[PDB]
Amino acid sequence: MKQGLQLRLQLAMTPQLQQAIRLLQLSTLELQQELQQALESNPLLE
Amino acid sequence: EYKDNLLGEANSFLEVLEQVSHLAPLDKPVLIIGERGTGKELIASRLHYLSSRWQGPFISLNCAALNENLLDSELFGHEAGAFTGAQKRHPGRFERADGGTLFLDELATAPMMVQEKLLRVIEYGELERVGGSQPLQVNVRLVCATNADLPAMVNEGTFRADLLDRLAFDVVQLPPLRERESDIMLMAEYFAIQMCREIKLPLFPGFTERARETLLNYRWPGNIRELKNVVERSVYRHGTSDYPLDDIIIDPFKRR
Amino acid sequence: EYKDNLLGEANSFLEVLEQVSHLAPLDKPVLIIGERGTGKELIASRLHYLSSRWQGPFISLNCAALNENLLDSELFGHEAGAFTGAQKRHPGRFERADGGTLFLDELATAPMMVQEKLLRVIEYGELERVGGSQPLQVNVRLVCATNADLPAMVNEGTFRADLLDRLAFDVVQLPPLRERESDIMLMAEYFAIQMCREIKLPLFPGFTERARETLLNYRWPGNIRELKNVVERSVYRHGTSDYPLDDIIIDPFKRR
Amino acid sequence: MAEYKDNLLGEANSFLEVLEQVSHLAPLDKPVLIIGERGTGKELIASRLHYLSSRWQGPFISLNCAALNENLLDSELFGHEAGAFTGAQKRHPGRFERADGGTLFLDELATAPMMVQEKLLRVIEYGELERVGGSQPLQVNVRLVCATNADLPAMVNEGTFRADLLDRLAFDVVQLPPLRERESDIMLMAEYFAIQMCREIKLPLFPGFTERARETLLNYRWPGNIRELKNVVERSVYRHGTSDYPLDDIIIDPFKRRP
Amino acid sequence: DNLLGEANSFLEVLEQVSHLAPLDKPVLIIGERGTGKELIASRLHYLSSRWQGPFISLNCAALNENLLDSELFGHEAGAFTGAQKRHPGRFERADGGTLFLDELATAPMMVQEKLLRVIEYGELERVGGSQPLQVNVRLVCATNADLPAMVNEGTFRADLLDRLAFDVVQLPPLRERESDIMLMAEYFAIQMCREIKLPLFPGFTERARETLLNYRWPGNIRELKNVVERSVYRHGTSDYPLDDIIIDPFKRR
Amino acid sequence: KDNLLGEANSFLEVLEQVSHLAPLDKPVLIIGERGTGKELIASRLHYLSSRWQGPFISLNCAALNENLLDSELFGHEAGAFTGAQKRHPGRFERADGGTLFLDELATAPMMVQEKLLRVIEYGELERVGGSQPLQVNVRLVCATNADLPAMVNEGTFRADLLDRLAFDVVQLPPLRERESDIMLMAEYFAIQMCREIKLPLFPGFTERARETLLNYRWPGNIRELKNVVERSVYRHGTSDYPLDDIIIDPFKRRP
Ligand SMILES: Nc1ncnc2c1ncn2[C@@H]1O[C@H](COP(=O)(O)OP(=O)(O)O)[C@@H](O)[C@H]1O
Ligand SMILES: Nc1ncnc2c1ncn2[C@@H]1O[C@H](COP(=O)(O)OP(=O)(O)O)[C@@H](O)[C@H]1O
Ligand SMILES: Nc1ncnc2c1ncn2[C@@H]1O[C@H](COP(=O)(O)OP(=O)(O)O)[C@@H](O)[C@H]1O
Ligand SMILES: Nc1ncnc2c1ncn2[C@@H]1O[C@H](COP(=O)(O)OP(=O)(O)O)[C@@H](O)[C@H]1O
Ligand SMILES: [Mg+2]
Ligand SMILES: [Mg+2]
Ligand SMILES: [Mg+2]
């Protein structure tokens, strides 16, 4: 009726998937470069 | 077989059945001269199972118990990225039913603005979805029934008389409670079998000519929902299937 | 070409049409004094397919069913996110107008304010209801049409002098329903054939001359497809056009 | 500072002198209120003043009151800077705010909101305006432009206008020579419109018109002052549609039943 | 509880009512101004095998239908979208027992439809993230005061009316029994006296008793309670038997 | 603090009256057939008070819009709708002790009163769901270009609204009453108009114009004097000849 905007419809973000997307937008050549530079310390990550 | 809900042995009911058989496949707009209680939501789903698309369903739900905003704002639904207050691409129930049949109800309740919009759809069929967009049409029958005399209501100048014709393919009357008299004994028997099954009452313990006369005198304000509901009240009065049925709770809402 | 459909053998139908043709290159307003269930829309079409910009937009949006006062403001525009709950103006009508004309049905109900807002449009036409957006004009022509009594409105003052005037540039009296009697027989058979074909009814029943006479007796003020509506009624009265035509249905409310 | 006379035509009555007084007014930027026939010299007068507005004066902010729905007419009225009113985003500046220095092209629409009326009173208050949630007043500027078409003093006695609607309004009045009154450039602006009409018709030659038409033209009331006649003129052009072919009649009242 | 159903039509009525109590049929009841309907419903619920069953008594007016089902359904949302776990769910809340509805008579038809046949399937009871499912709670609504003409006023959804229970809870006024009057009266009185930490029931003179015996007492149990209270503070001391049938805190006197 | 004073014993009387009202900050409302510089009055009052250093900046009351009186009384809300989150405070608080003329009072609304009154009579800053109300003792005063006691007869306002003004409502004389320095007053109006009309100077008007000034109904009292003054000016635009005629009823159409 009398239109407008009315109240209706928080937490904490993390860059997890954000860093992942940083990898994906980055090219797979250097993306694998990071992937190695990532999996190095992750001992269970081959 | 649609279970033959309201199996009307009445020749009037029989002819109503024959004609409903004739035109339900005629998946076209038509005029049901009908009221709630008297076959309250009785034939629509049959004609939908009798609709051209047996695969095609019966959304309907176009009862006009809604007054002002919700009636339309669900009718067309509404737009996604625009509305009074919701980002819901409410496609409207018109989008909902594909293949089959749907009915509009309490049609007398509608305003003239709604009247012209709907009668237009009955003609236009394409529609911009409330918010406004490229209009689009559906191909299906049109169904509605009203308890009033829309010839007078249009004589009262209230509705799309254009609708009151374009829908009005043939004003299709159906039997009232007062209509059902000799088959009313059978209807009582059938509702009784149904109740004794449901109420876990063993069976028809028997009819009372006294209860029979009480019901016969019962002018029966409602037609069907009254039949079942008063059956429920009277059964609660009896609550057993031994003594012949005389405890007739004609007014489950009688005082004290 | 409107399929050349709705043939009016009244050479006044032709004369109207000729006026229409003269109007066809012409780009100025026009009233069509239409009739109840007459069909100004179809003729407006016949014009639009012939429009000087026949390639132009041809939208049918009447504010007769303007249940929302705000449905107007929309039709006049919306700022992108005006009010809120929305993204942008749903501008389809405003779209058709630029690169198009204006067509409406039964302009009687308009909020007088709405009307004179339309006035500030016709002479100049700003980007409107646009939540403060800068103006903008739609290369918009116009056409008008109703069954109302213009003198009745004038007494009602329903059209302002600026309104009644600048609003109106031509007047197209739909012949009275019975005015175009030879046309009635004409387009009547036109429907008869059109029905016998599209119905795929294996034979065409034809027409009973008695039925023809009775039909002519129908003042049938509504005849827009109200002709076609009573036609479908009569077709069902025949039910099947195999036999020669005699079963003519006009009043469908009647049981029995 | 140029001509821009445009199709300001047919002022052979004292509407010429009307224009003269308008000119006398034109330098001053104070409130403008006028009077006259709708769709008839009126908004043309508006153009007239818009020319009287320096070309470099600014946006001829057109104010069309028959719009505005009900409410957030208020929004663009006072303004809307907050959230929850106009899609939020930036401080949406109202059409009132849209004009900064511009034309208060007030239209005398006679719509119901004297609520609005009081608002505009505050619009014409101290050169200032303040938005929805509009956290501060802001001293505003705009040229002010009204006109009329009906008995403002009567409506005052009728109470119909806010008394202050007029009290703040109309430093002076500016009426129009009625079509029943102006009556002077009849043939003149008649021919002017006819010229335009044939030219658009691309009619090969000016039909000419019989004097019976002009006799009717004198006889005609022309309730719509400027256009109704002009529409009539174009209508004659159409109903004839012939070049050099002298007219002997005109088209105005199609409501007249055909013979 | 102190029903003191000394109408004894109250007695047989209670008999049938508890007879329905184990059955979970839908509940639609008409209650007197002072009927203590809560107690009746409470007694049925404990008498129901939903003795422990959930019994959300919906004083159905405080909501916003702008979140009508959003209560009646609720919404499941968590993590970055919203802090907490998820909504309890109105149909979900009373799940498994009494589904008591109050504040129903003067209600918005938003609710009326939103509930209308909303349990006939019931599998559509949690949305907007809340996860739809069907349920079983003994549906209860009561305190019915709308005349049948209100259904003839149509504002009573006759769809709800047919959707209503098989009959209606007949309810009589306090002018009816006039029986446990002195009794439940004294019950209230001593109850207050202890609540007052009062000395003792000083008594009542028969003059008050007679003045009482003439009263329609529309406020039924409430009338009893309130009359007791007014006369109670009026005595302000517990020396001699009281004497006043305190009618109403209205007269300036 | 300075304006076209009415220069008059009634005018100087209302002056001394407001002067008695000067540092006083208790609530108030205005009496007056019309306004006669209603704004200018409260405005000079604003320029005077201890709210001279305070915020001598008004607010137009009955301007406001329907749903938002909460914020109107208390500025933009932090928690109203999602968008804003900052408990922006009272326009009152935007003064909260300054001088903020409660104008437009007559046109105000019903439940609108229901709140604003009660709060003013009693209520610290209780905003939308807030923690703790803060009383913005803001210099309080309203106005009435209309007759409240009449409204009382109508009963539209609260009798509390009657209580609202903590001061007696001074009134100014009707133009028909006041009509005091209108000679000198008009002279100043004319010096003004000539400056605005950039006119060289004013030789004068008719003494007949003077009598018509006497023979003047003068409803738009504080306005129409200077109004039709400069109106006569422009419709004349002539300074060589006296304003023998003045622009009487612009509403009147000449022959
Ligand atoms: N000349 C025609 N040819 C075909 N159909 C027509 C004609 N005139 C009217 N109609 C029919 O009348 C129905 C409604 O028509 P009409 O009354 O013209 O629309 P409106 O209600 O806008 O006047 C339309 O669906 C149309 O099929
Ligand atoms: N010189 C003229 N010749 C012909 N028509 C005119 C002339 N001047 C104005 N008109 C017509 O008068 C109509 C209304 O103009 P106007 O009164 O200015 O509108 P408004 O109501 O906005 O003031 C216009 O549509 C225009 O076509
Ligand atoms: N038999 C009773 N025993 C104890 N209290 C009763 C009895 N009957 C009525 N009351 C009192 O009367 C009041 C009636 O309340 P309620 O049933 O909510 O009224 P309504 O049904 O009109 O809302 C209860 O608060 C209760 O304390
Ligand atoms: N004492 C005064 N000194 C100077 N100007 C005044 C005085 N009183 C009123 N005015 C003028 O009157 C105008 C205000 O009009 P006002 O009386 O507030 O209108 P309303 O009566 O509609 O409220 C201002 O422009 C101001 O210049
Ligand atoms: Mg039509
Ligand atoms: Mg205009
Ligand atoms: Mg004022």
Three-state SS string across F161-188, please?
HHHHCCCCCCCCCCHHHHCCCHHHHHHH
CA–CA separation, E214 vs E217, rounded Å?
9
Which residues of chain B does C195 touch, with a Cβ-Cβ cutoff of 8 Å? Answer: none
A6 to chain F: which residues are within 8 Å by CB? 81
**Biggest alpha carbon–alpha carbon distance for chain F:** 71
Map residue E49 onto helix, strand or coil. Answer: helix
Rounded CA separation C226/F40 (Å):
69
Conformation bin of residue D170: beta by default, left when phi > 0, alpha when psi is -120 to 50? left
User: Contact E156/E45 with Cβ under 8 angstroms?
Assistant: no
The answer to whether D234 and D197 have CB atoms below 8 angstroms apart is yes
Residue B62's SS3 state is strand
Q: Which of C124, C117, C112 is nearest to C76 (CA)?
A: C117
Going by their DSSP bridges, the two strands E138-141 and E27-28 should be labelled as: parallel
Q: B171 has which bridge partners?
A: B31
Cβ contact D38:D223 at 8 Å: no
**Residue F14 to residue F6: CA distance in whole angstroms:** 10
Judge contact between B190 and B210, C-beta under 8 A. Answer: no
- For residue D154, the one-letter residue type is A
Distances from the Cα of F145 to the Cα of E61, F33, F225, angstroms: 43, 6, 18
Q: Which two tokens stand for residue F92?
A: 């009152």
Give the CA diameter of chain C.
67
User: How far does the CA of residue B225 sit from the closest CA of chain E (Å)?
Assistant: 6
Between CA E164 and CA E172, with CA E167 as vertex, the angle to 5 degrees is 115
Q: How far apart are the first and last CA of chain A?
A: 60
The residues, any chain, with a CB within 8 Å of residue E132's CB and separated by 6 or more, are E73, E123, E124, E125, E126
Measured distance CA(E131)–CA(E86) in Å, rounded: 10
Report helix angle D15-25 to D42-52, nearest 10.
40
F65·D25 Cβ contact <8 A: no
| Phi-psi map region of C163: left, alpha, beta (phi>0 left; psi -120 to 50 alpha) | alpha
**Interatomic CA distance for residues D8 and D6, integer angstroms:** 5
Let me know: does C93 contact C59? Beta carbons within 8 Å.
yes
Phi, psi torsion values for B173, nearest 5 degrees? -75, 160
Q: C-alpha B4: how far from its chain's center?
A: 16
Q: Which domains does chain D have, with CATH numbers?
A: 7-179 (3.40.50.300), 180-259 (1.10.8.60)
- Ligand 2 pocket member D38 (CB < 6 A): yes
- Spell out the residues 6+ positions from residue B100 whose beta carbon is closer than 8 angstroms to its own: B48, B51, B52, B53, B54, B55, B56, B57, B58, B59, B140
Tokens representing D68 are: 């505005």
Nearest CA in chain E to A10: E82
Three-state DSSP class for D120? helix
| Cβ distance of C80 and D87 shorter than 8 Å | yes
3-state secondary structure labels for all residues of D227-240: HHHHHHHHHHHHHH
Mutating to test ligand 3, I would choose from E3, E221, E226, E229 the residue with most ligand atoms within 8 A of its C-beta, which is E221
Per DSSP, C123 falls in state H
The token duo for E192 is 């207050």
**CA C166 to ligand 6 centroid distance, Å:** 11
Report the run of H or E that residue B18 belongs to, with start and end.
helix B11-23
Distance from C-alpha of D152 to C-alpha of D171, rounded to nearest angstrom:
14
Q: A2–D71: do the CB atoms touch at under 8 Å?
A: yes
Quick one: residue C202, left, alpha or beta (phi over 0 = left, psi -120 to 50 = alpha)?
Answer: alpha
**Going by CA atoms, what residue is nearest to atom 15 of ligand 3?**
E36
Neighbouring CB atoms inside 10 A of C25's CB total 12
Distance CA F16, CA E252 (A): 49
Tokens of E183: 């009794």
- Please report how the helices B182-198 and B225-238 are oriented relative to each other, as an axis angle in degrees rounded to 10: 60
Q: Please state, in angstroms and rounded to a whole number, the distance separating the CA atoms of residues E154 and B42.
A: 21
Question: What is the DSSP-derived secondary structure letter of residue D257?
Answer: P
- Residue E34 assigned ligand-binding role: yes
Distance CA E142, CA D42 (A): 67
CA–CA separation, C165 and C162 (whole Å): 5
CA dist C48 and C32 (Å) reads: 14
Here the contacts of F114-121 (C-beta below 8 Å, separation 24 or greater) are F114/F158, F115/F69, F115/F73, F116/F69, F116/F73, F117/F158, F117/F160, F117/F161, F117/F163, F117/F164, F118/F160, F119/F73, F120/F27, F120/F164, F121/F160, F121/F163
CA atoms B46, B50, B56, B62: torsion sign: negative
Minimum CA–CA partner of D99 in chain C: C132
DSSP string covering chain F, please?
Answer: -------SHHHHHHHHHHHHTSS--S------SS-SSHHHHHHHHHHHSGGGTS----EESTT--STTHHHHHH-S-SSSSSS--S----HHHHHSSSB--EESGGG--HHHHHHHHHHHHS-----TT-S------PBP----SS-HHHHHHHT-S-HHHHHH-SS-------HHHH-SSHHHHHHHHHHHHHHHTT-S----B-HHHHHHHHS---SSHHHHHHHHHHHHHHHH--SSS-BSS----TTSPP-
Report which secondary-structure segment, H or E, holds B33: strand B31-33
* Cβ-contact F232, F243 below 8 angstroms: yes
Ligand 1 midpoint to CA F174 (Å): 67
- Nearest by CB to F250, which of D84, D137, D170? D170
Whole-angstrom distance, CA of residue F15 vs CA of residue F50? 17
Among candidates B40, B65, B225 on the partner chain, residue whose Cβ is nearest the Cβ of E157: B65
Q: Please state, in angstroms and rounded to a whole number, the distance separating the CA atoms of residues C35 and C225.
A: 12
Ligand 1 neighbour C46 (Cβ under 6 A) = no
Q: Which of C140, F240, F183, C89 is nearest to B79 (CA)?
A: C89
**Residues contacting ligand 4 via CB (< 6 Å):** D 164, 167; F 3-6, 34-40, 145, 222-223
| CA–CA dist D214, D211 (Å, integer) | 5
Sequence-ordered list of residues with C-beta below 8 angstroms from that of D253, at least 6 positions apart, any chain: none
Neighbours of E180 (CB within 10 A): 19
Please answer whether residues B195 and B187 qualify as being in contact, where contact means their C-beta atoms are separated by less than 8 angstroms: no
Cβ atoms of E130 and E73 within 8 Å: the answer is yes
Give the nearest ligand 3 atom to E36 CA. 17
Contact between B165 and C37 (Cβ < 8 Å) = yes
Which residue of F39, F48, F105 sits with most ligand 4 atoms within 8 Å of its CB, as the best mutation to test the pocket? Answer: F39
Instruction: Mark which residues 226-255 of C lie under 8 Å from B by CB.
Output: 226, 229, 232-233, 236, 249, 252-255
Q: What is the C-alpha to C-alpha distance for residues F233 and D250, in angstroms, rounded to an integer?
A: 46
Amino acid at C136: L
Chain B residues within an 8 Å CB radius of E156 = none
- Is there an interface between A and C (3+ Cβ pairs < 8 A)? yes
Cross-chain Cβ contact B66/E113 below 8 Å: yes
- Residue B201 bridge partners (DSSP): none
Please check whether residue D167 touches F, CB under 8 A. yes
For residues B62 and B74, give the distance between their C-alpha atoms in angstroms, rounded to a whole number.
10
Q: Whose CA is nearest to atom 14 of ligand 3?
A: E34
Collapse the DSSP code of D101 into the 3-class scheme (helix H, G, I; strand E, B; otherwise coil) and give the result: strand
Cα–Cα distance measured from residue B9 to residue B182, given in angstroms and rounded to the nearest whole number = 9
For residues F127 and F147, what is the distance between their CA atoms, to the nearest angstrom?
32
How many CB atoms neighbour CB B136 within 10 A?
Answer: 12
Chain F residues inside the 8 Å CB shell of D122: 60, 63, 104
Tell me which amino acid residue C135 is: P
Chain C residue numbers with beta carbons less than 8 Å from the beta carbon of D77 are none
CB E6 within 8 A of CB E179: yes
DSSP, residue by residue, E146-214: --HHHHHTS-S-HHHHHHS-SS------HHHH--SHHHHHHHHHHHHHHHTT-S----B-HHHHHHHHS
Distance from C-alpha of E93 to C-alpha of E75, rounded to nearest angstrom? 13
Tell me the β-bridge partners of D92. Answer: D80
Q: Looking at the partner chain, which of D37, D72, D97 has a beta carbon nearest the beta carbon of C161?
A: D37
Count A/F contacts: CB-CB distance under 8 Å.
Answer: 11
Q: Is the CB of C229 under 6 A from ligand 1?
A: no
Two structure tokens written together for B54: 């047996």
Determine if ligand 2 sits within 6 Å of the CB of residue C246: no
Q: Is the CB of E4 under 6 A from ligand 3?
A: yes
* Ligand with the closest atom to the CA of D234: 2
Nearest to E57 by CA among E94, E20, E31, E27: E94
Token pair 């109590």 is at which residue?
A: E21
Look at A6 and D72 and tell me if their CB atoms are within 8 Å: no
* Position in ligand 3 atom list of the atom nearest CA E222: 12
Q: B–F contact (≥3 CB pairs within 8 Å)?
A: no
B and E in touch (3+ CB pairs within 8 angstroms): yes
H or E element, residue B144? strand B143-145
Express the helix, strand and coil content of chain E in percent, nearest 5 each: 40, 10, 55
Q: Is B39 annotated as ligand-binding?
A: yes
Which residue of F222, F225, F228, F229 sits with most ligand 4 atoms within 8 Å of its CB, as the best mutation to test the pocket? F222
Most B CBs within 10 A among E162, E168, E177, hence the mutation to make, goes to: E162
- Give me the torsion for CA of C91, C92, C97, C98, rounded to 10°: 70
- Nearest Cα neighbor of D146 from D62, D40, D54, D70 is D62
DSSP state of C240: S
Handedness of CA D44, D45, D46, D48 (dihedral sign): positive
Other Cβ atoms closer than 10 A to A29: 7
CB C205 within 8 A of CB C196: yes
Q: Token pair of D115, please?
A: 């609520």
The answer to whether the beta carbons of residues B78 and B86 sit under 8 Å apart is yes
Does residue C7 line the site of ligand 1, with CB under 6 A?
A: no
Strand ranges of the sheet holding E27-28, from the earlier edge strand across to the other edge: E27-28, E138-141, E98-102, E55-59
SS (H, E, C) A1-46: CCCECCCCCCCCCCCHHHHHHHHHHCCHHHHHHHHHHHHCCCCCCC
Instruction: Centre a 10 Å sphere on the Cβ of residue D176 and count the other Cβ atoms it contains.
Output: 25
Tokens coding D192: 């002017």
The Cα F151–Cα C88 span in angstroms is 45
Chain C residues 62-121 within an 8 A CB cutoff of chain B = 62, 64-67, 74, 85-88, 90-93
D72 to chain A, any CB pair closer than 8 A? The answer is yes
Q: Which of F92, F166, F71, F99 minimizes the C-alpha distance to F135?
A: F92
Select from E245, E242, E240, E238 the least CA-distant residue to E224.
E245
CA dihedral C201→C204→C210→C213, nearest 10 degrees, is 90
For residues E146, E151, E156, E161, the Cα torsion angle rounded to the nearest 10 degrees is 100
Place of tokens 């005699």: C246
CA distance C168 to C159: 10
Query: How far is it, in rounded angstroms, from Cα C223 to Cα C233?
Result: 13
**Unique residue bearing structure tokens 């549906």:** E139
Residue nearest to atom 1 of ligand 3 (CA): E3
Buried b (16+ CB within 10 A) or exposed e, C157-175: ebbbbbbbbbbbbbbbbbb
CB C59 within 8 A of CB C100: yes
3-class DSSP assignment, residue D52: helix
Cα–Cα distance measured from residue B171 to residue C234, given in angstroms and rounded to the nearest whole number:
14
Phi-psi region of B220 (alpha: psi -120 to 50; beta: other; left: phi over 0): left
Q: Is D9 in the pocket of ligand 2 (CB under 6 A)?
A: yes
Longest dimension (CA), chain D: 68
Q: Is D204 exposed, middle or buried (0-12, 13-18, 19+ CB in 10 A)?
A: exposed
Neighbours of chain B (3+ CB pairs under 8 A): A, C, E
Q: Are 3 or more Cβ–Cβ pairs between E and F shorter than 8 Å?
A: no
SS3 (DSSP) at D3: coil
Q: Is the dihedral of CA C110, C113, C114, C116 positive or negative?
A: positive
Contact B175, B11 (CB under 8 A): no
Residues whose CB is less than 8 angstroms from the CB of residue F68 and which lie 6 or more positions away in sequence, other chains included? D132, D133
Q: How many residues does chain B have?
A: 256
Pull the structure tokens for residue E6: 């000394």
